[PDB]
Amino acid sequence: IEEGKLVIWINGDKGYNGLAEVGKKFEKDTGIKVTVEHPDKLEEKFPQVAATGDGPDIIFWAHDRFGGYAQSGLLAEITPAAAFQDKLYPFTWDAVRYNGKLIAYPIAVEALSLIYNKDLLPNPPKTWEEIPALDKELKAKGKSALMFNLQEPYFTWPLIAADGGYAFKYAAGKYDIKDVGVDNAGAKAGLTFLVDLIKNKHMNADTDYSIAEAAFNKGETAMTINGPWAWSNIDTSAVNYGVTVLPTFKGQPSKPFVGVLSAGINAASPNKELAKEFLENYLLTDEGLEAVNKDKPLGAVALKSYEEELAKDPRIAATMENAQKGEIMPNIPQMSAFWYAVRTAVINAASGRQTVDAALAAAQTNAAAKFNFTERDLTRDVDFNIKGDDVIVFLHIQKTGGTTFGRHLVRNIRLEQPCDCKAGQKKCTCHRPGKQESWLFSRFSTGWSCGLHADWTELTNCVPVIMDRNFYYITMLRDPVSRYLSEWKHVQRGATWKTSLHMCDGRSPTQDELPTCYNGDDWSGVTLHDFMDCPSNLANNRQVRMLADLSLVGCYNLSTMNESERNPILLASAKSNLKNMAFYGLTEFQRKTQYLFERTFHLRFISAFTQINSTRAANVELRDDMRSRIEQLNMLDMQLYEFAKDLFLQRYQFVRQRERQEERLKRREE
Ligand SMILES: O=C(O)[C@H]1O[C@@H](Oc2ccc([N+](=O)[O-])cc2)[C@H](O)[C@@H](O)[C@@H]1O[C@H]1O[C@H](CO)[C@@H](O[C@@H]2O[C@@H](C(=O)O)[C@@H](O[C@H]3O[C@H](CO)[C@@H](O[C@@H]4O[C@H](C(=O)O)[C@@H](O[C@H]5O[C@H](CO)[C@@H](O)[C@H](O)[C@H]5NS(=O)(=O)O)[C@H](O)[C@H]4O)[C@H](O)[C@H]3NS(=O)(=O)O)[C@H](O)[C@H]2OS(=O)(=O)O)[C@H](O)[C@H]1NS(=O)(=O)O
Ligand SMILES: OC[C@H]1O[C@H](O[C@H]2[C@H](O)[C@@H](O)[C@@H](O[C@H]3[C@H](O)[C@@H](O)[C@@H](O[C@H]4[C@H](O)[C@@H](O)[C@@H](O)O[C@@H]4CO)O[C@@H]3CO)O[C@@H]2CO)[C@H](O)[C@@H](O)[C@@H]1O
Ligand SMILES: Nc1ncnc2c1ncn2[C@@H]1O[C@H](COP(=O)(O)O)[C@@H](OP(=O)(O)O)[C@H]1O
Ligand SMILES: [Cl-]
Ligand SMILES: [Cl-]
Ligand code: NA
Ligand code: NA
Ligand code: NA
């Protein structure tokens, strides 16, 4: 981001040419250039790039996305004088308040309305229920009743919410992120109606924004559902249209989710005062807003003075009617998870590939960020025969507390013949009784015989050869921000692990495949900024990479497939390999780790594990924005760890409960 310039991001369905005009006036008056851009998926890109030193100075989106940005420290708190604040409506400022702080400037209120072609349909239907009959009439004329975007849940939500669907329950002054309303009876009734429209061929599951707009603007369908921004192209096509209240469902209003177009200032911007000047004194004026509105209409604007000027527009009146009947969107971080969940559910139910009940049950789980596991997932019972051919293999991922855990395995297990750990000697002899055969494959027993910090791909391909059995793989995992910081500090004091083989498909990577991040013999002294800056840093997503079958993505050759392909493959492989291991622990839960290992393998340790809170990672003072950047660099790990933590904790609860019940039964007998 350059100082003395403004870069602005706004979505491509908005009046960006109009905004650019406002930017030109600001430039005329101040010599400061303003660059407007409308990148695809700007709302996903922003938290990926703003976490670094890049991104726009100002980002425009509906307010629902901004709580997540603010929680991640990506937005500047906005500091409008009371005088300015009074120029906008208070309920629009509420839309942009997060944890008590104002995090953006509200611009305009948007709600979906029913838009109809007066040359085909002079009185629009008042109910969803009459649409099928109406369609039958229109089909005999070679037309259809209704087409709208079925791919974005924004557009189907009004019908789903009408009879009772909700996102997150509001109770006791906040949104309850565990109380999700996407699979209740009202939600199902709404979605069922939509799926029935499609089954009866009144709509097509494939219809998206472009298809619906093209049909309406060409006079092929009598109605569409859309927002104020859409009115411009309709006018361009010279359709004689009206904008009105959405149809009712089961006698109740459609309830659209109401968005407030908002402008946030990037926390990493060197131009915060200039962005403030632009927004308050150029955009949020009658003239600034008129420029944008004339390009693509904004809806009901937040600035009282200009809202009053336009209030007479019946299209805006309909917009306010629909907005009053709907709900303002939550701005909480969990909103994006809600939307992603419903998006998928609607597509799969609409297509007929999944029933409404199943699809919405899936959305329910996803929106609430829950994980469902089978009994089999929770039960890990190994009759570990140390006298037999059983072998435990410890896959040690760097900086997960593996030195501690590996020491426990060789020093701390009660066995008839425990590992022989000679004083002043790194490794131990962990042999079966009477034999010269090892029961433990690990750094402190057999050594790094399949390579330094051999990962899942290396071990599963090397261990069976180098030992000739039942192999019981185990590992430890750590929250990725802490693990990443620990690795940074260790590399900063000399660690390279440069002798690791990184074998996959029978060879090590080439230098082209895996470039080194440092010149010279190590990366000692590296700042966290420079650590984060190297694209080929093996610290990024280390736990996923080391748990996945890397052959599935062409090993270390990043040109073999795109990131959109490779990433879901890696995460799924890591999850599966982890889940299917005999056991794993978590660094943050030392006592539970001990207990589960003991109960899995029917072994006991001599001394209790202990929790060390004062780690080198914990001692790093971390700005939220930098924490966010570390999360983004480790996004696969973040997802793996969320999965792993929940499964680990469900395993703990399951095993403990079973054991408590067993004790009780024995007592009941006596
Ligand atoms: O045997 C020979 O061939 C010998 O021959 C001699 O010549 C003759 C001998 C005899 C006769 N005769 O007539 O009788 C004639 C001629 C010749 O002079 C020798 O050069 C030659 O020796 C060669 O072979 C031997 C045997 O293989 C080699 O010795 C082995 O390997 C040594 C070694 O590699 O240094 C040494 O191993 C011990 O020490 C290593 C280094 O500390 C240990 O490996 C390290 O483990 C670290 C760890 O786990 O902590 C790891 O650290 C990294 O990860 C951790 C955890 O994440 C982090 O904390 C660290 O920060 C991180 N550091 S990093 O970022 O820098 O990576 C290290 O990476 C890893 O290297 C090793 O475990 C340890 N093994 S031991 O405990 O068993 O001792 C030993 O001497 C020996 O090991 S072993 O075979 O017994 O297992 C010798 O190196 C080799 N010399 S060479 O010049 O040919 O290369
Ligand atoms: O990978 C699947 C898709 O993911 C991405 O779309 C996501 C967004 O990133 C989420 O934020 C969310 O989108 C919401 C949106 O936040 C909400 O404001 C509303 O968007 C309206 C908007 O307010 C209005 O001004 C106008 O622009 O129409 C928008 C609707 O199209 O509703 C959105 C949900 O429909 O969820 C979507 C997932 O549906 C990514 O951008 C997609 O390209 C990708 O396919
Ligand atoms: N019992 C324990 N409780 C908490 N953290 C522990 C631990 N034993 C080790 N760790 C942490 O695990 C990291 C070392 O992992 P490894 O042995 O795999 O390299 C260190 O993190 P820090 O570098 O942040 O201090 C260490 O503090
Ligand atoms: Cl070794
Ligand atoms: Cl614990
Ligand atoms: Na040795
Ligand atoms: Na160096
Ligand atoms: Na800290």
Side-chain angles (χ1 to χ4, degrees), residues 1 3-4 6-23 25-27 29-100 102-140 142-177 179-198 200 202-275 277-307 309-311 313-323 325-369 371-374 377-382 384-386 388-467 469-510 512-620 622 624-652 654-655 657-659 661-662 664:
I1 307 189
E3 192 164 9
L6 287 182
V7 179
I8 302 185
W9 284 4
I10 187 164
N11 201 41
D13 57 5
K14 298 315 189 308
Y16 55 80
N17 286 313
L19 186 53
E21 290 171 16
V22 180
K25 175 176 184 168
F26 189 78
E27 190 182 16
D29 289 9
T30 72
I32 312 298
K33 186 186 172 50
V34 180
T35 300
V36 179
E37 305 183 333
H38 51 98
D40 288 322
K41 296 171 166 57
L42 75 84
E43 86 289 359
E44 295 186 341
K45 274 173 205 168
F46 180 74
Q48 291 168 350
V49 299
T52 71
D54 262 319
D57 292 278
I58 303 170
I59 175 167
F60 285 73
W61 195 262
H63 69 286
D64 64 297
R65 262 287 184 169
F66 282 72
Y69 302 156
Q71 190 67 43
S72 294
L74 305 181
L75 297 171
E77 179 180 9
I78 72 151
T79 61
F84 186 85
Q85 278 189 59
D86 280 293
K87 291 200 257 183
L88 315 187
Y89 292 117
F91 85 104
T92 70
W93 287 116
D94 292 340
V96 299
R97 199 174 281 106
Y98 184 71
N99 286 344
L102 294 181
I103 61 178
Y105 288 96
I107 307 301
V109 180
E110 311 171 352
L112 295 171
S113 297
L114 186 63
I115 299 170
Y116 68 108
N117 181 344
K118 293 167 159 186
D119 293 329
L120 297 172
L121 183 81
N123 301 121
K126 287 283 175 185
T127 71
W128 278 94
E129 284 89 349
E130 62 199 281
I131 278 161
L134 180 68
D135 184 64
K136 194 175 170 184
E137 289 224 310
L138 287 164
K139 288 282 169 65
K143 265 86 171 76
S144 70
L146 174 64
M147 291 178 75
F148 69 101
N149 187 2
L150 304 180
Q151 307 308 306
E152 284 289 344
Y154 184 70
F155 292 82
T156 47
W157 189 250
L159 175 60
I160 296 169
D163 191 41
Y166 61 91
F168 295 106
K169 175 64 64 157
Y170 196 87
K174 69 170 181 63
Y175 286 106
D176 178 355
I177 70 177
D179 189 345
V180 166
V182 304
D183 74 332
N184 61 29
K188 290 171 168 135
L191 188 51
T192 288
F193 193 83
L194 187 90
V195 173
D196 280 335
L197 287 171
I198 295 156
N200 295 321
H202 305 304
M203 295 197 307
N204 189 290
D206 294 330
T207 298
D208 61 13
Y209 194 92
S210 289
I211 294 167
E213 178 182 52
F216 185 77
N217 295 7
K218 274 197 290 200
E220 295 171 350
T221 189
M223 306 172 292
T224 189
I225 292 167
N226 224 321
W229 53 85
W231 302 338
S232 177
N233 292 344
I234 308 179
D235 291 338
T236 294
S237 295
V239 177
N240 177 27
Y241 71 102
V243 181
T244 196
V245 60
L246 294 156
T248 61
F249 178 61
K250 293 170 75 172
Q252 304 160 89
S254 293
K255 298 179 45 169
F257 251 147
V258 173
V260 177
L261 181 65
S262 305
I265 293 168
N266 188 340
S269 175
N271 303 294
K272 299 188 181 66
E273 259 297 332
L274 285 182
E277 183 62 13
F278 178 83
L279 292 171
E280 295 192 16
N281 301 153
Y282 284 77
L283 179 58
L284 285 171
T285 62
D286 294 345
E287 317 83 55
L289 291 182
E290 176 183 55
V292 177
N293 199 63
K294 271 177 179 175
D295 181 5
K296 298 297 181 77
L298 290 162
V301 303
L303 187 76
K304 299 152 148 169
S305 60
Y306 194 59
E307 187 274 336
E309 195 181 323
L310 302 189
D313 190 333
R315 302 173 305 166
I316 300 187
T319 298
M320 299 259 74
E321 184 172 349
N322 283 308
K325 284 172 185 208
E327 312 278 355
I328 183 75
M329 285 190 289
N331 67 5
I332 67 183
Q334 297 76 21
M335 273 310 281
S336 49
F338 157 76
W339 281 127
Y340 285 129
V342 181
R343 180 184 202 269
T344 296
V346 170
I347 282 167
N348 289 325
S351 76
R353 286 189 70 201
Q354 200 172 23
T355 59
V356 165
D357 283 5
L360 290 177
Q364 164 62 49
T365 300
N366 282 322
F371 293 88
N372 300 313
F373 296 109
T374 73
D377 288 332
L378 298 188
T379 306
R380 288 288 176 283
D381 286 320
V382 173
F384 182 64
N385 195 8
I386 192 152
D389 300 279
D390 297 353
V391 176
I392 287 175
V393 183
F394 175 34
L395 190 175
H396 175 179
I397 303 166
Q398 287 91 324
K399 315 320 301 171
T400 55
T403 305
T404 293
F405 185 67
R407 281 191 111 251
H408 281 305
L409 297 178
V410 293
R411 300 190 76 81
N412 200 21
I413 301 187
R414 174 169 296 110
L415 296 171
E416 289 205 288
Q417 180 180 321
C419 299
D420 179 37
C421 302
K422 302 195 192 179
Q425 191 153 122
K426 172 183 175 193
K427 306 172 185 173
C428 307
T429 297
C430 301
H431 286 169
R432 321 186 184 267
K435 327 199 187 136
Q436 294 293 301
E437 290 168 23
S438 295
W439 60 268
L440 179 61
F441 185 100
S442 81
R443 167 202 197 188
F444 287 133
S445 55
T446 53
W448 299 117
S449 42
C450 292
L452 174 61
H453 281 286
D455 65 10
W456 187 92
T457 301
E458 295 180 285
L459 291 166
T460 51
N461 283 286
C462 163
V463 163
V465 191
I466 205 143
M467 294 204 69
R469 298 182 190 285
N470 297 81
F471 291 105
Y472 299 105
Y473 278 73
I474 65 187
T475 199
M476 291 289 296
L477 300 176
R478 186 171 180 190
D479 89 82
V481 171
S482 300
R483 200 215 65 76
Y484 189 86
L485 285 170
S486 174
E487 194 172 326
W488 161 53
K489 292 303 293 191
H490 199 175
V491 165
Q492 187 197 60
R493 74 185 179 264
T496 65
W497 307 281
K498 57 169 70 155
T499 55
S500 291
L501 310 184
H502 297 293
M503 291 288 302
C504 184
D505 284 349
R507 51 166 193 92
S508 297
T510 71
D512 278 333
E513 277 170 350
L514 187 53
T516 304
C517 289
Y518 55 85
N519 304 290
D521 281 38
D522 62 41
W523 209 3
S524 57
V526 64
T527 62
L528 178 58
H529 171 263
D530 291 344
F531 191 69
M532 290 183 320
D533 226 56
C534 174
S536 46
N537 194 341
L538 289 164
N540 297 346
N541 292 307
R542 179 178 293 280
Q543 296 173 106
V544 164
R545 193 183 59 252
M546 290 183 64
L547 285 169
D549 181 355
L550 296 186
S551 195
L552 299 173
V553 299
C555 295
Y556 294 83
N557 192 335
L558 301 167
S559 73
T560 72
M561 53 175 78
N562 294 329
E563 176 160 5
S564 59
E565 299 172 279
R566 176 172 48 251
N567 280 354
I569 290 166
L570 289 175
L571 180 58
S573 178
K575 281 180 177 174
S576 168
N577 289 339
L578 182 71
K579 194 174 79 175
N580 291 312
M581 286 194 181
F583 164 93
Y584 66 93
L586 302 193
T587 320
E588 71 177 301
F589 298 119
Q590 292 284 322
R591 290 196 328 142
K592 289 173 180 63
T593 290
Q594 179 194 339
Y595 173 89
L596 280 174
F597 177 96
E598 285 178 337
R599 270 64 187 174
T600 295
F601 290 110
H602 304 262
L603 291 174
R604 296 294 184 272
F605 292 96
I606 300 298
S607 304
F609 286 29
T610 66
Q611 200 64 49
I612 306 170
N613 299 121
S614 51
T615 61
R616 300 178 186 271
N619 189 252
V620 175
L622 199 58
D624 292 347
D625 62 312
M626 194 108 306
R627 170 180 291 273
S628 175
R629 177 172 175 190
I630 292 170
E631 296 175 344
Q632 294 286 329
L633 287 172
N634 291 272
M635 191 43 73
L636 306 176
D637 272 27
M638 291 299 291
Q639 293 176 83
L640 178 66
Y641 193 80
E642 170 185 37
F643 170 96
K645 184 180 180 175
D646 203 71
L647 172 59
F648 179 86
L649 289 172
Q650 286 189 47
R651 283 182 174 169
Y652 179 72
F654 173 84
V655 174
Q657 284 169 356
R658 185 176 69 186
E659 189 179 88
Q661 295 161 17
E662 290 171 356
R664 284 177 226 150

